[PDB]
Design a protein around this ligand. Structure first.
Ligand SMILES: Nc1nc2c(c(=O)[nH]1)N[C@H]1C(S)=C(S)[C@@H](COP(=O)(O)OP(=O)(O)OC[C@H]3O[C@@H](n4cnc5c(=O)[nH]c(N)nc54)[C@H](O)[C@@H]3O)O[C@H]1N2
Ligand SMILES: Nc1nc2c(c(=O)[nH]1)N[C@H]1C(S)=C(S)[C@@H](COP(=O)(O)OP(=O)(O)OC[C@H]3O[C@@H](n4cnc5c(=O)[nH]c(N)nc54)[C@H](O)[C@@H]3O)O[C@H]1N2
Ligand code: SF4
Ligand code: SF4
Ligand code: SF4
Ligand code: SF4
Ligand SMILES: [S]
Ligand SMILES: [W+6]
Lengths: 963, 214
């Protein structure tokens, strides 16, 4: 027997890094009473099968780490040294700071006299790294305090992209899942470095290749992904839409789209109204003075019943498909090859290979993560991806889909729990000031007169009511609706988002900041500005695993602590393997994990920190009064704790929901106290509670479905790797979203050899059907108002069809496709002293700002220092040899890094001039390790995209000089 | 005996195997600098039994040929490191007759360290300047003799790493070689009749490392 594990208790966990969701096994000494002695992969997990990339494989070094925080640390104003402090004192003082700030800042009514009941002097960042139960309770604590500036990781990389998928399919989530990649016949990786940033995915990517798939990587750089793909096609930065526009034209011209799929399941047959037009790069309804569109000019022609008119013949000139063909005929191969830099040979090769998946016996998938989609037309980039897949019949089928790879382990869940300023849990919107009543709130949900359109969002009044009764089970929903804060209706929505919080920070408009599970001192663009702007805070609360650049910004580079008067509280949380809870991976698998070792030293799980902190705020309001104490004192926190401790199990049951009294929903009698079996049984009269309607089904009376580790599969399930009995995915265990589009109108799969669902013996067999109904009776996209996959998407600010507008401001001056050079609905200086395109990306070995991985000696061993990857052409132009220390500078700042000269970066040919791109990792910071370097964000601009409210971190002008 | 089949045509240079080797043995990390390469540590050492080497070869057309080589002791069937060590002291180097692993014992501090390394045609052995013992990959024989796969094999997501009895791994290596040759015509096996760590190189093995093959 192995001595290292002989007397150690074995528990299972889920990796705390990227959204792959790999399973671990943890061995804890002394039968669970000691520290962790080993952390490695779970051989029984269906996604990774015991394998781990270096970040997951080093989690033992992350947990058993003598550099971790051990106790709360207090930093008085103008002090130069931390002082160790107890947990009781730390949370008492912060509770005083929260109440003092809230009382002096609480606006019960806005300037228009409408109820808002909010405080705008406190902002909160984070976090996708917390458990789902912790994320949900955290958001509700903040909103019970009246906060509206609530943001986290998802805003920066995902939120620019998910409106593209919701417009296209009705949901913003990744459509398929990791195991499903092995069923694809052609994998297009574009805007993703999956082998480095989602490494275990290449288990399934390569298994697809074993079955004959072609792997295509489209990337401005040659990466570790590119070495293992069949085709590497370089593309210059920002040319993704011309690339995809050419593929659309290719598919349409050569009649490679799946006509029966396109005719029945997309909106190709819908008749657009005569007011739609497109000339000179401008759609109709353009307000040139305000640089905005009148989207009503793009509306469909409606019949006498309000339903959009349909020509199933697809011959009407105002049919979507015909208007689509007209729009993309400009994207010929020669124009696309010139602007992308991709050879005409390579374009034809890639177009032919991927468009071949339009046959029903072939499946194509597109993988993207962040790439360069943060800019204004990033949403249109992903829209074109979705349109390509709808044309080829790839949505809802095994091996198909738009696999938008999520970032952090629980960025899906943290978004599901509403840790963004515009959404409650369950993607119910944060109401604005004009939604004065719950009835007015529910009136905004669109209805549809189409009998075949499920329009599942019409059930929203049940979900808002049950969510409110999860928070306030004895007030009626219309009354508790007045407890939660509202945003201003006449204010731009991005004013509440990530970037404006940093700008309001720099203007001193924030008294306190919650840096909960984030490192904004390195993660936010323009670090010099943000680090100086944090000194304009009254108090800062940082909850993390280690002391870091945000906790200790007051003693950062160039800072004088005696001049900075911010009061910083550092609260050390425990690592993932030291607590129980669930995380939702990219494919929406909500996976339960267990505590291995006890929390190290006196660290506490986030759930216990925020609960005890909120209790101190609650008790201080119960003995002092203050501004609007109602939502703090009535909040249901009894279902959150057990044995004087935050209970992940009880919170997860409340998020699932339970009946508050006896009710008969949907032809079935349910008794009080029972768990809700699915969101179809939620009510709007108050008989049901549920913290998140997407979780209704995750924790029923049958037990914790998220904790299921059952590999039982039928032949059809195992052939495509659904694994329906391993954990649980929302919604109601539908593993492949939109799977009704995978069959014909008799219920027969287009691809029987890779069937997702099949109508057999009066029932859908295989995956859980995404939308109940007999075959041929319902449209397959049940979350859409009209029920169809949207090739024409009139809800987008830039137009119903993606159109190329130049994202590169400085080196490009000509648009070959229209008059309009830049986005007409969106002032970079372009100083000639900085002629190179700086960019930031990741490496396999480090995580995010490196706060975690720069503390793990094995990962620092592999990547010890910040580097700067440049071409041989750039190195020869600047006289820089490989391994030399270089100075990269911009209008925002400067740093030193070791140059990596490699043919993996090639110059961009733009309008007859060689334009050079330099690459840097953003994984580094001044605290640790020694000689590691600072963050690349010292160079990035804080000027953000007017659309998205996110700064540019993928194409910013820099200079690089030999030191 | 046991055997590794290492299919470098599937390696993504994720370096999970480099870390998993250190995690299982609780090995310390080296002091490393970046000198113009993602490769680190730059070489095997007393506390680094496996490092992934990066080599960039040019090719016409877009991109490069990026060659990844997770180096480790080959565990030769007839290990010359044992012959040179048996000159000074027999027992310093031991061959496990059930698994086939070549194992360094604590008596390697009793032998001439540099002579044992020079006898290995793969330049695998490394010596600690203070304890004077020899260290290298030990096949994770502890895990192998307890029914577990070596740490570097279990952690590998791509299917590059494979482990089992020598007969079944050669049959796998032969079958995989014929399939890999369709995409990499210069695919070769590294000394498949003499070693228990059988690498599949996509091109000339010397392009991966100077001592990739004997
Ligand atoms: N190892 C590791 N993995 C991670 C992370 C990490 O820090 N380390 N971070 C996680 C997080 S939070 C996120 S959101 C995801 C991000 O996942 P990724 O999107 O994969 O992360 P990146 O490396 O920043 O961007 C990937 C690729 O986009 C390419 N690219 C740049 N510009 C363009 C362009 O204009 N067009 C196209 N087609 N491609 C372009 C870059 O060359 C790069 O190779 O990764 C997650 N995974
Ligand atoms: N230049 C540039 N900038 C970027 C990016 C880029 O590509 N280039 N990428 C952007 C992206 S996509 C992202 S998502 C952001 C991320 O920005 P950040 O979130 O600030 O990145 P980190 O703080 O380093 O990683 C998240 C944190 O989770 C903490 N954590 C881990 N476990 C727990 C826990 O149990 N509880 C708590 N409370 N915390 C925990 C870790 O210690 C870590 O500090 O960076 C963005 N900024
Ligand atoms: S970082 Fe991602 S791919 Fe690597 S082990 Fe963790 S979950 Fe798996
Ligand atoms: S077999 Fe074991 S000792 Fe050898 S390289 Fe792999 S993990 Fe390290
Ligand atoms: S590779 Fe070298 S050290 Fe390893 S068994 Fe063979 S001769 Fe000995
Ligand atoms: S774990 Fe596998 S894929 Fe990753 S570097 Fe090692 S051999 Fe290559
Ligand atoms: S993220
Ligand atoms: W992210």
């Amino acid at each position: 027997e192995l001595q290292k594990l002989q007397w150690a208790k074995q528990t299972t966990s889920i990796c705390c890094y990227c959204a792959v969701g790999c399973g671990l096994i943890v061995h804890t000494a002394k039968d669970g009473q000691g520290r962790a002695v080993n952390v490695e992969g779970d051989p029984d997990h269906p996604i990774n099968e015991g394998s781990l990339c270096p970040k997951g494989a080093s989690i033992f070094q992350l947990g058993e780490n003598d550099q971790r925080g051990t106790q709360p640390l207090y930093r008085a104003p103008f002090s130069d040294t931390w002082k160790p402090v107890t947990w009781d004192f730390a949370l008492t003082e912060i509770a005083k700071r929260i109440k003092k700030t809230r009382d002096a800042s609480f606006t019960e009514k806005n300037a228009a006299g409408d109820l808002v009941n909010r405080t705008e002097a406190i902002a909160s960042f984070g976090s996708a790294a917390m458990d789902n139960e912790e994320c949900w309770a955290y958001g509700n604590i903040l909103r019970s305090l009246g906060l509206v500036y609530i943001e986290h990781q998802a805003r920066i990389x995902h939120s620019p992209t998910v409106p593209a998928l919701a417009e296209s399919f009705g949901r913003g989530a990744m459509t398929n899942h990791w195991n499903d990649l092995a069923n694809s016949d052609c994998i297009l990786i574009m805007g993703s470095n999956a082998a480095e940033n989602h490494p275990i995915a290449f288990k399934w990517v390569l298994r697809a290749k074993d079955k004959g798939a072609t792997l295509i990587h489209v990337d401005p750089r040659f990466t570790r992904t590119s070495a293992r793909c069949d085709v590497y096609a370089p593309i210059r930065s920002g040319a993704d839409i011309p690339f995809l526009g050419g593929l659309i034209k290719y598919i349409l011209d050569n009649k490679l789209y799946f006509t029966d799929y396109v005719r029945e399941y997309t909106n190709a047959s819908l008749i657009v109204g005569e007011k739609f037009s497109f000339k000179d790069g401008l759609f109709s309804g353009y307000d040139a003075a305000n640089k905005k569109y009148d989207k009503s000019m793009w509306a469909f022609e409606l019949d006498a019943n309000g339903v959009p008119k349909r020509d199933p013949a697809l011959k009407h000139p105002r049919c979507v498909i015909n208007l689509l063909k007209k729009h993309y005929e400009r994207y010929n191969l020669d124009k696309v090859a010139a602007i992308t830099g991709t050879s005409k040979e390579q374009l034809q090769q890639v177009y032919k290979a991927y468009a071949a998946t339009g046959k029903p016996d072939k499946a194509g998938t597109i993988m993207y993560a962040m790439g360069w989609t943060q800019h204004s037309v990033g949403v249109q980039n992903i829209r074109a991806m979705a349109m390509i897949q709808l044309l080829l019949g790839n949505i809802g089928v095994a091996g198909g889909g738009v696999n938008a790879l999520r970032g952090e382990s629980n960025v899906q869940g943290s978004t599901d729990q509403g840790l963004l300023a515009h959404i409650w849990p369950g993607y119910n919107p944060v109401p604005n000031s004009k939604a004065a009543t719950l009835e007015l709130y529910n009136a905004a949900t669109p209805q549809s007169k189409d009998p075949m359109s499920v329009n599942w969002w019409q059930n929203r009044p049940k979900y808002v009511a049950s969510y409110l009764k999860a928070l306030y089970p004895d007030e009626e929903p219309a009354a508790a609706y007045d407890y939660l804060p509202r945003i201003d209706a006449g204010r731009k929505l991005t004013d509440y988002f990530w970037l404006n919080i940093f700008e309001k920070m720099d203007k001193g408009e924030f008294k306190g900041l919650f840096a909960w599970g984030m490192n904004p001192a390195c993660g936010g663009a323009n670090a010099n500005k943000n680090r100086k702007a944090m000194g304009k805070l009254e108090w800062l609360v940082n909850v993390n695993l280690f002391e870091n650049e945000t906790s200790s910004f007051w003693k950062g580079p160039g800072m004088n602590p005696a001049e900075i008067g911010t009061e910083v509280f550092f609260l050390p949380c425990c690592v993932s393997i030291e607590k129980e809870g669930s995380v939702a991976n990219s494919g929406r698998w909500m996976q339960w994990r267990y505590r291995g070792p006890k929390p190290y030293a006196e660290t506490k799980p986030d759930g216990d920190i925020m609960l005890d902190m909120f209790k101190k705020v609650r008790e201080l309001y119960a003995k002092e009064g203050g501004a609007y104490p109602a939502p703090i004192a009535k909040l249901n926190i009894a279902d959150w704790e057990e044995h004087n401790e935050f209970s992940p199990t009880k919170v997860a049951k409340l998020m699932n929901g339970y009946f508050l009294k006896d009710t008969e929903v949907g032809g079935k009698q349910f008794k009080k106290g029972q768990q809700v079996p699915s969101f179809a049984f939620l009510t709007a009269d108050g008989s049901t509670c549920s913290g998140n309607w997407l979780h209704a089904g995750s924790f029923t009376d049958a037990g914790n479905l998220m904790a299921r580790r059952d590999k039982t599969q039928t032949p059809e399930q195992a052939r495509i790797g659904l694994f329906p009995n391993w954990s649980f995915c929302w919604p109601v265990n539908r593993r492949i979203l939109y799977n009704r589009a995978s069959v014909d109108k008799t219920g027969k799969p287009w691809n029987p050899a890779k069937a997702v669902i099949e109508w057999k013996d009066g029932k859908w067999v295989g995956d859980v059907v995404d939308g109940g109904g007999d075959p041929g009776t319902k449209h397959p996209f049940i979350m859409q108002t009209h029920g169809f996959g949207a090739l024409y998407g009139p809800g987008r600010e830039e137009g119903p069809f993606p159109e190329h507008y130049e994202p590169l401001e400085c080196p490009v001056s000509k648009n070959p496709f229209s008059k309009q050079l830049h986005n007409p609905v969106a002032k970079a200086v372009c100083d000639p002293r900085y002629p190179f395109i700086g960019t930031t990306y990741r490496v396999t070995e480090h995580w995010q700002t490196g706060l975690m991985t720069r503390r793990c000696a094995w990962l620092v061993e592999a990547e010890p220092q910040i580097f700067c990857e440049i071409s041989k052409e750039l190195a020869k132009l600047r006289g820089i040899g490989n391994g030399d220390t270089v100075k990269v500078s911009s209008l925002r700042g400067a740093l030193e890094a070791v140059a990596i000269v490699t043919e993996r970066i090639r110059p961009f040919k733009i309008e007859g001039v060689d334009v050079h791109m330099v690459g840097l990792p953003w994984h580094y910071g001044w605290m640790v390790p020694k000689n590691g370097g600072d963050t690349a964000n010292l160079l990035t601009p804080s000027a953000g995209d007017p659309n998205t409210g996110i700064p540019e971190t993928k194409a910013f002008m820099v200079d690089v000089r030999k030191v | 005996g046991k055997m590794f089949f290492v299919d470098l045509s599937r390696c993504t240079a994720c370096r999970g195997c480099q870390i998993a080797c250190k995690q299982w043995k609780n090995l310390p990390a080296e002091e490393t600098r970046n000198t113009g390469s993602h490769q680190n540590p730059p070489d095997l050492s007393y506390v680094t039994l496996k490092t992934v080497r990066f080599t960039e070869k040019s090719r016409k057309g877009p991109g490069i040929d990026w060659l990844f080589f997770p180096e480790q002791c080959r565990h030769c069937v007839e290990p010359p490191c044992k012959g040179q060590a048996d000159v000074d002291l027999e027992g310093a180097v031991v061959k496990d007759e059930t698994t086939g692993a070549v194992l360094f014992t604590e008596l390697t501090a009793k032998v001439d360290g540099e002579s044992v390394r020079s006898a290995c045609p793969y330049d695998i052995p490394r010596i600690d300047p203070v304890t004077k013992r020899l260290s290298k990959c030990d096949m994770c024989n502890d895990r192998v003799q307890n029914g577990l796969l070596p740490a570097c094999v279990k952690t590998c997501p791509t299917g590059t790493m494979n482990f089992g009895d020598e007969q079944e791994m050669l049959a796998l290596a032969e079958k995989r070689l014929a399939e890999v040759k369709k995409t990499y015509p210069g695919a070769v096996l590294g000394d498949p009749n003499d070693v228990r760590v059988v690498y599949l190189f996509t091109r000339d093995p010397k392009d991966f490392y100077e001592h990739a093959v004997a």
